[PDB]
């Protein structure tokens, strides 16, 4: 899809309220092409067109566009082109989508303003109590260990912070078995150590405010008494059930950059559909995403993996400001994927049918994500600035 | 000293132990040529030598550094080549520096870990007595708004998010006085109403930790009922003294992008020496940032304004990570530049012998500031990658 919406032979820019659309094809006039327009807010439709593509070979067509709905609702309003054959082919159906485009119109920012969460203090955990909910973080660990909603627990593994990916073959950069890449990302991921880093806990506290309660923590990954990451956090519990959680990252500038900078968890759910506000329907990263789309998307959960044969990182989202799985709903502005395999046995597994469901849902969720390359897979392809070497990194997250 | 150092005639290279010098001469030997090299950890010397440089036109020498001392000490090793004549010539003295190149080397993140604050709560401000000292939070405007040392108050105008600069030529983008460009950066700014955005104030509350005080803020920068900016701060006080600020600015996307994304206050101090740990002796900005090298600098005062015969934005230094000013001390990682001209006075004076120098110290203090362009003066000229687009924006500050 992506190879699809580079190639496609119609190009768009928006003026205004104007798009101009740029035929690319040589020889045939727009006979067979139908704009469709929509303008959604944040996935919700608030107005839609149609206009016929009257474009001759190699010229542009100027489509005015009505006056645009201003509504009243915070949000970003997204305008997406579509160009349909509205009439079979010898090669396509009617309502073939040959071309698309998708930006920014205005925004507007929100400035609008929203009992308290009790917390129990032992040596061993500090559990914040609100409703029926309850949230458990391990002292000695320091990271969100257990989640109640009712009687039952939601997570089989805590949440966690997560700087690797399992290798796709872009990382692998063998092109002969025989010869390995030392300056391949995932030799070089491997001698540092990103694969065996062991989290040292810094810091873990907590604070009562008089609104909410205050996790603190600080904990720093090592190999052999290198630092590699330092991860700051605050987890911020209101009265109205959100949990803020603050992510600062430092890295390491002569460690090789990290594949991500995220959280990863075992949800106890296994639940059928993902909706999420976000990129494209299909799996898109920061290096291949231009044909997905800002869109509310909804599919089944086999959906979100891509079933690679070599197994490897996949079916992750990128730009996705809302996630829903089940009764749960991350906020902010990330990048996910979400799948009954981890990380490790997508990395450890050679062939996609030797893949078994893990018990519950892993949810990676990425503040950053390093590009997947390909300009070859036997070389490191990954362009510098789709890499993750800014040293240090800020994401935050709602989790409810 | 941009152009010194793009133009320079020896071109460096940082394998992993060994510098590779090209020669960009065409017809000389390197025979007036002397390289010295300098490690520091953060501005203190570590190691340093001196190598005389052999290199035929248009050839390659390769320079072995020797075993470099691994510090115990946390934080950046800087390695730092310039290449000295050490005869004068007929157009140079003897000692000029011809080139320069910086590479970061080995990385050590710290991992250690470092009374109680007194907070006043009345109905105008929040009040934060520790020792002698006292910080003020005006809590009808929501900013620091006065700071005690002593018995001596140390601001003159409170601690302000700032998002303009005053125009530099490429930012007003005329060549000819009767034709302005519309699409000029000033022009674009002034017509959002950037320069007259008005902070609408959110929430301000105060929290006492168990080691510190927490004093949460939120702004709304609006110019005829549209939101062009939030800010969204935490001041964290401790009873070691620091005041941690944090920062996260939303610029909204259909505004044009802002000049810069920091904060400005009017110090009371008037001090002789600057003194701080960044990028370059010289003014530097980050489209101009390349011939600066990060070490400790110390100019005095008058050496961090540049007297530009039209008077703009000028004297930023970026890579900060610590900045002194009589008694007080920032650190994180950001922009600066200080003076005694205010951004407005800057703005509103058409030559630079009509500035008058203002009470105390202006201080700006950018975790953001756009490029400065000038591929041309008279149309927009800084590229995509160097304007301020990324919509949210998180800094962080300490300020000591």
Chains 1, 2 share one sequence.
Not at 250 to 262: M, N
Not at 343 to 352: A, G, N, V
Request: proline share 5%; hydrophobic share 35%; net charge negative.
């Amino acid at each position: 899809t992506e190879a699809k919406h580079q190639q496609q032979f119609f190009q768009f820019r928006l003026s205004g309220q104007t798009i101009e659309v740029t035929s690319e094809y040589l020889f045939r006039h727009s006979d067979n092409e139908l704009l469709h327009w929509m303008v959604a807010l944040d996935g919700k439709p608030l107005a839609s067109g149609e206009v016929p593509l009257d474009v001759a070979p190699q010229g542009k067509q100027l489509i005015e566009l009505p006056e645009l709905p201003q509504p009243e609702s915070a949000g970003q309003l997204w305008l997406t082109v579509r160009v349909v054959q509205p009439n079979a082919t010898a090669w396509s159906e009617a309502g073939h989508i040959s071309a698309w485009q998708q930006w920014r119109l205005a925004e507007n920012l929100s400035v609008t303003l929203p009992a308290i969460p009790h917390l129990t203090t032992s040596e061993m955990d500090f559990c914040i109590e609100l409703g029926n909910k309850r949230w458990q973080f391990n002292r000695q660990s320091g990271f969100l260990s257990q989640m109640w909603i009712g009687d039952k627990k939601q997570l089989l593994t805590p949440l966690r912070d997560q700087f690797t990916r399992a290798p796709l073959d872009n990382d692998i950069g063998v092109s002969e078995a025989t010869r390995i890449d030392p300056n391949a990302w995932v030799e070089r991921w491997k001698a540092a150590g990103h694969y065996q880093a062991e989290a040292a806990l810094l810091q873990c506290t907590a604070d009562t405010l008089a609104d909410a309660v205050l996790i603190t923590t600080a904990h720093a990954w090592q190999h052999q008494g290198k630092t590699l990451f330092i991860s700051r956090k605050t987890y911020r519990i209101d009265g109205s059930g959100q949990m803020a959680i603050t992510v600062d990252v430092e890295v390491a500038s002569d460690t090789p950059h990290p594949a991500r900078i995220g959280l990863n968890c075992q949800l106890a759910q296994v639940a059928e559909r993902v909706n999420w506000l976000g990129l494209g329907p299909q799996e898109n990263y920061p290096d291949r995403l231009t044909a997905a789309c800002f869109d509310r998307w909804d599919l089944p959960l086999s959906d979100m993996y891509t079933p690679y044969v070599f197994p490897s990182e996949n079916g992750l989202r990128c730009g996705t400001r809302e996630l829903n799985y089940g009764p749960h709903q991350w906020r902010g502005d990330f990048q996910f994927n979400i799948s009954r395999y981890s990380q490790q046995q997508l990395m450890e597994t050679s062939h996609r049918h030797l893949l078994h469901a893990e018990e519950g849902t892993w949810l990676n969720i990425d503040g950053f994500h390093m590009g997947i390359g390909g300009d070859d897979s036997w070389s490191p392809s990954v362009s510098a600035e789709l890499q993750l070497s800014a040293g240090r990194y800020h994401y935050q997250l709602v989790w409810c």
